[PDB]
Design a protein around this ligand. Structure first.
Ligand SMILES: CNS(=O)(=O)Nc1nccc(Cc2c(C)c3ccc(Oc4ncccc4F)cc3oc2=O)c1F
Ligand SMILES: CNS(=O)(=O)Nc1nccc(Cc2c(C)c3ccc(Oc4ncccc4F)cc3oc2=O)c1F
Lengths: 278, 226, 275, 273, 275, 226
């Protein structure tokens, strides 16, 4: 039903959207009565490089999945690129974390299944990696769907945006931080830190450079054994192997008993979110 | 001598500013009898406009000296008609090449527009030095040639065509200088500019830049005479 | 800004010829009785409150040994030197741009309550050939509620450029906005014609009496016909013998910017560019 | 320097407003609906330091706005910043222009350090080429006067010191951090590309410069001008604080290389009049 | 005997702006009068060309001319050294003057002025108390007369000059002649005769000159011949003002000619020197 | 044509930038046979300098193109040899006028040094376009020209005159470019600069400025060679 509403929405320019609410805001198309969003990223780059960027990001139309957010389009206006974006009513999971404080374990299993499915879809169709898996890139709706967003579809856009935001929290893999080979194991690592960070609410151990030093030269933190199930700790420690050679890949994460148990569970995420809102 | 070899010699002497030599080489190359491409037409127009501009600046200097001397010896005036005969001969050979093969072999409407624009311009440069009945016949010929030039340009070019804008400004300068129609020149220029501003959205960025380099001159000229 | 500099500057020789220095780059220097101390204090005080591009920048004053000031070294020459020594041909837009810049700078000066009293073509420095500079505030003043109580002193300069009420000294303080307005108008005159006013007189006190009674005005017939009529009537009504008829600077700048918007351009008729 | 709001009007937007007040000006305006007192503190430090700045090579300042939205009014530079010319416009400067630009910004920073002020965030976005001939230094929002815990840096990590990357000292800002940022600038204009363009990860750069592995490569600098620039740019980018030289020395080296540099490619003779 | 003059040949000795120098190819003491001026180089070349005419003026009662040049952006005219100095310091160190010396200097000024009129048809235009020079030999000579009209046009801008002695018929642009010079001569004579102006700004001074009659000396301090002399020299209208032929046959000038006064002795006693 | 009329026509041409025209005009004026004045000598020097400098710039561009093509058609070589024959012809014409009557009627040593400078410089240009034993005979002639000119100048004439200063500068230029003598060129340049700086204190302001206008060039090319 997402594609058939796209067919009713044709060419999209700057004037016909109105401001409602890098920076993220919200639009709505007045005739169609649909609520969208847009992503505004400011660069200072050559126009030929800008055309390369727009031709590289036109590929996102083919990215269609129940675990990947929808793509509308993008255009260059007012000295900036505006990426037309489908609106997500529930918002990102950091706002949900600030609203609630802690997340139930079944919800953790469901979102782990969703992100695993999204990573497998991206590797089986576009064979690329997300490179920025984080709770701000996890989006949920009142319909109960969990999809990924904000991945490196354009390497030239990665080179462009790499000179921008500082970074207070870091979800970086040590192997590419050192400068070695990187694969999906880096994304599994960053998924591990993101999941444990939004499960306990904070980082259990300050300036960014010493955090980088701690990621390089210290073992990663572990959960206490007496709180949750031992299979959960085994699962996250399988996610949290420092050397990517023994770190489990997508198929071992998929065949893990925790994933199978969570998929066997029936959870009403939409009802719980509606209870959270009211 | 080969046509493409004359073309590359013309490009070489364009890079070496030997404009009369490279004008002679393309004179031979067009005398070969084949139709011209866009860049060859650009080279021809640039070469002959530079040659006529150089002798035109010389003629303007000599005319200023003569008119300040006519407030002592006929050397100034006789050198003035010497340079004038040089310019008349040059324009006569160019117009002879035009009416010999170019204006009749311009099967493309774009080439017909280009050739009529240049040939009206060369009549204008002849009218710059004409005095008597030569003045009225030359200005009538330029009037006609320009009139069918704008007719065919309006019937088959986009409004923001840079050559269309250039022939518009040449025609406005034609009315100001020699046709003595300042209100008609101003009217033509303002209509062409405003309708170009209506049609500016239909071009790519480089075509729009080529249009900016013409509309800036058009605005400067309108502020100059108005 | 404020403060005392030291021996870091260079000394050349112990109205001269050169006073150029060298301190964080090239600079310009000027030069034991109290009358120098008063004027030095006034000029230091008035250059403390000068922050604009059209005025020379002040950064330091030094007191020990000789009494001196330091400002930046402008590149170029005075407008008097360009107009009466070199006679370089300036195009029309350059001349009116110079007029606009000078009017804007003096408008800023009068808006920030500064009275220069001594603006001259020898004083207007054309830096680099594009931007004009205003300087030499050694006799500039700040008016106030008690400024009319003190009696103003003699200028002892060139008589061509003060108002008739200044050279008549019929009151305590002839200096006002309108005196500098008349000075800027005669600056406009010498900028347009290209020569000093009253060229047909070779005597000074002739000029003093002759414009002291209002018996003559500078000739407006020498203004060129290609000049716009708006700045002609501006020059005409800004040199009026009546103080009230001389307009203030904001509408002068408004008229000049309207003329800028309605300016013509460079000569010839612009044919097709060789593209 | 108090200014009333009505006589200054906005015309066009560039944050930055192209205003008019006795001519065109540049207005740096802070749009904060609920102003908090440390913003007032930083505003006061900006005004206090900008009142003390009087030089030709700096961006000149006139007055401040207090009522309604907070704003800073400075002069309007003609042209654009060096970043646009070097990385967006790609204008082919010649080598004497580069030397003159380096000498001018060296003179400006030398005077600015003679006032004992640390600018702390200078980069190519904060250097304005006025009329394509003179440089201007602006954006003093993070500067301070030497006389507590330092506030965390926020600008791009390329120009800031490896020591402030290492955030080990309480107040790591000093002269030599400015010297090293200036060295990055002289690395920037004399080749025309940003350092570490082959790496597109921000924290990888942060860690590699923090540990000391990172080093700007002088290989991509041309060899047409002699080796004086080579030893200069090698010396001014050095990692240790004490081995980075002071600005009178770098000035003296600049004019020493300027005394022996010719502007002619051939043999000229009798000039035809 | 003195050839071409260059700046290296002159060494500064003292200041009289006038300096005292010496010419080392000749060894004689030399008077060094320097004046600052700014004009195109062709104009000052023309000035040099027309002051080459100064060679032919030779009289016992005119200061001799030796040469001139242009150097260091400064136009240089050279003067014969005049050891007794001008009358300004003479009246400063003497207070007042005897009438006999006034008759002698009247003889001197009329003889020099008639010489200038009959040999060059050129008047003086600046007969001032400062321009009258005396020496230990008793020669009273003229200087600084108006020979080069472009030079008057050159410096006509500035003279400092807080006090003037210029005739009323020269104010309104009317016809000017030698009557102006003898009127100014009468002013100079009465001025050092009383030693002051026995009656303050420049415009009020010239206003008093144009609109009020000249004052009259008291009878009890000067002879009646002197009073009639100055009353004939202070006639406001130039037509009624007596010309040179009347002033060469006046009773006072004949009495002054018949007198034999040791003016050289008086001046050397006043300056106190032993040659 | 009348001699002073040809001089006035040459003045009209140099304010009308017709360089081949002024060259032919004073070619007639110098075939009149009378001795010329200093301003006429200066005008001829700068005018044939403009002409042969234009052909020299064209030849340098063509030599660069040919040496890039000699790493596919002899057209580049043919055009280079054509303009080389043009330069040889105009240089031979100037030299023929010189050895015909100018160097024989040059009575005063100033015009003697001036004409020696001219014919040595056109020897230098002919050697620049020459190659072989012809080139070494031509540079021998250029040698003899330069040492005769500087011997006369040094014997009878003070260093600070611009013709001697330009002669020494062109001496060093010819050494560095053709004879490959950088040490000799630098030595003569610095010696002439020192002598001129010593002797400049006995000159007027305009003469001092005219000398320093090329003392700037002497300091510059000494800086370039060092
Ligand atoms: C520690 N980070 S890093 O150093 O590894 N650098 C980088 N990593 C990863 C990525 C990038 C850049 C990136 C960004 C910023 C981006 C954002 C939005 C976007 O829209 C949509 N997104 C998903 C679905 C549908 C869409 F419409 C496409 C984007 O595409 C991009 O390429 C990086 F710079
Ligand atoms: C209210 N009068 S005014 O406004 O007309 N001013 C003027 N009037 C008349 C004349 C002038 C200027 C003047 C000056 C001052 C002058 C000075 C020296 C000179 O050399 C010698 N002189 C005499 C003897 C020997 C010499 F070597 C010639 C000069 O010749 C001059 O003309 C004025 F400025």
């Amino acid at each position: 039903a997402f594609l058939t509403q796209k067919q009713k929405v044709g060419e999209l320019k700057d004037d016909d959207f109105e401001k409602i609410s890098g920076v993220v805001f919200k639009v709505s198309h007045k005739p169609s009565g649909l609520v969208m969003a847009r992503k505004l990223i400011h660069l200072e780059i050559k126009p030929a490089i800008r055309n390369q960027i727009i031709r590289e990001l036109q590929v996102l139309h083919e990215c269609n999945s129940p675990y990947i957010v929808g793509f509308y389009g993008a255009f260059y206006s007012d000295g900036e690129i505006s990426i037309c974006m489908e609106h997500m009513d529930g918002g990102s999971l950091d706002q949900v974390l600030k609203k609630a404080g802690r997340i139930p374990e079944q919800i953790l299993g469901k979102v782990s299944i969703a992100v695993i499915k999204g990573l497998t879809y991206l590797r089986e169709k576009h064979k690329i990696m997300h490179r920025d898996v984080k709770p701000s890139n996890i989006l949920v709706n009142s319909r109960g769907e969990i999809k990924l967003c904000d991945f490196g579809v354009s390497g030239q856009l990665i080179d462009a945006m790499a000179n921008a935001f500082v970074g207070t929290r870091s979800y970086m893999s040590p192997e590419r931080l050192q400068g070695t080979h990187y694969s999906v194991q880096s994304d599994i690592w960053s998924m591990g830190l993101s999941l444990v960070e939004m499960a306990v609410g904070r980082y259990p151990i300050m300036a960014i450079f010493e955090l980088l030093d701690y990621i390089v030269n210290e073992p990663p933190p572990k959960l206490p054994s007496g709180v949750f199930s031992l299979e959960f700790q085994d699962f996250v420690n399988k996610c949290l192997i420092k050397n990517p050679a023994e770190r489990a890949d997508l198929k071992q994460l998929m065949v893990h008993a925790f994933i199978k148990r969570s998929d066997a569970e029936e959870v009403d995420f939409a009802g719980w979110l509606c209870s959270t809102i009211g | 001598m080969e046509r493409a070899s004359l073309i590359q010699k013309a490009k070489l002497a364009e890079q070496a500013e030997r404009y009369e030599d490279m004008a002679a080489f393309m004179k031979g190359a067009v005398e070969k009898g084949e139709e011209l491409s866009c860049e060859e037409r650009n080279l021809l127009s640039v070469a002959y406009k530079n040659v006529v501009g150089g002798q035109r600046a010389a003629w303007r200097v000599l005319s200023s000296i003569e008119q300040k001397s006519n407030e002592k010896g006929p050397e100034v005036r006789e050198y003035r008609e010497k340079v004038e005969t040089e310019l008349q001969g040059v324009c006569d050979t160019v117009l002879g090449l035009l009416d010999s093969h170019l204006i009749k072999e311009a099967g493309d409407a774009e080439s017909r527009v280009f050739y009529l624009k240049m040939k009206g311009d060369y009549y204008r440069y002849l009218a710059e030095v004409a005095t008597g009945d030569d003045k009225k016949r030359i200005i009538d010929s330029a009037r006609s040639a320009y009139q069918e030039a704008m007719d065919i340009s309006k019937k088959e070019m986009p409004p923001t065509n840079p050559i269309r804008l250039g022939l518009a400004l040449n025609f406005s300068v034609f009315h100001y200088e020699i046709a003595n129609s300042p209100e008609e020149a101003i009217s033509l220029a303002k209509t062409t500019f405003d309708e170009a501003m209506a049609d500016l959205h239909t071009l790519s960025e480089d075509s729009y830049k080529d249009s900016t380099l013409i509309m800036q001159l058009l605005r400067d000229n309108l502020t100059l005479w108005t | 800004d404020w403060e005392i500099e030291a021996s870091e500057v260079m000394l050349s020789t112990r109205f001269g010829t050169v006073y150029k220095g060298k301190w964080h780059g090239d600079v310009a220097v000027k030069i034991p009785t109290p009358e120098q101390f008063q004027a030095f204090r006034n000029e230091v005080a008035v250059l403390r409150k000068t922050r604009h591009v059209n005025i020379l920048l002040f950064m330091g004053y030094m007191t020990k040994d000789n009494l001196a000031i330091v400002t930046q070294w402008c590149e170029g020459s005075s407008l008097y030197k360009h107009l009466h020594v070199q006679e370089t041909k300036f195009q029309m837009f350059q001349l009116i741009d110079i007029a606009r810049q000078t009017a804007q700078g003096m408008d800023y000066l009068h808006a920030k309550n500064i009275i220069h009293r001594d603006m001259k073509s020898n004083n207007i420095f054309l830096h680099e050939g594009l931007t004009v500079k205003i300087g030499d505030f050694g006799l500039a003043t700040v008016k106030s509620r008690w400024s009319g109580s003190q009696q103003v002193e003699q200028p002892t300069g060139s008589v061509l450029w003060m108002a008739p009420e200044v050279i008549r000294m019929q009151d305590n303080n002839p200096f006002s906005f309108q005196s500098d307005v008349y000075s800027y108008g005669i600056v406009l005159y010498e900028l347009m014609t290209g020569e000093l006013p009253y060229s047909h007189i070779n005597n000074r006190d002739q000029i003093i009496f002759m414009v002291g009674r209002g018996y003559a005005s500078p000739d407006l017939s020498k203004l060129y016909k290609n000049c716009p009529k708006a700045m002609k009537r501006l020059v005409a009504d800004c040199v009026k013998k009546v103080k009230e008829e001389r307009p203030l600077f904001p509408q002068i700048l408004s008229s000049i910017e309207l003329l800028q918007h309605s300016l013509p351009k460079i000569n010839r008729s612009a044919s097709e560019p060789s593209l």
